[PDB]
Amino acid sequence: GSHMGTVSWNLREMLAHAEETRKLMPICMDVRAIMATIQRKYKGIKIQEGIVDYGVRFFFYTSKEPVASIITKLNSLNEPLVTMPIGYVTHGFNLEEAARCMRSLKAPAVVSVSSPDAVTTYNGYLTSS
Incomplete structure (x- = not known):
């Protein structure tokens, strides 16, 4: 596995893939249902806003940021990702x-x-045509 493009995975498959690929995985903190899931497995990490390299190369972010700005913070890093939109x-x-x-x-x-x-x-x- 090396390509990009949309899939229909769950949190498990994203987490698994991210581990294997070492690729970055962003997480909207607001979704405390995802926070609990990750925090259960990865407990020794304190959640912080921004890059949290601990086991999986996470990127926790705040839903109040513009989609624009938050995208730009991934663009700076230029790192390959896996997440939902x-x-x-x-x-x-x-x-x-x-x-x-x-x-x-x-x-x-x-x-x-x-x-x-x-x-x-x-x-x-x-595509957009």
């Missing part, structure tokens, strides 16, 4: 706006969705 539900965004806003990323990343049929939909927007 950065301005989606985690910004109150629709999947279309999410893709549009997330095209402003300049680092090569895996995206996710909640189901396999949504993959082709979201990728559709990442």
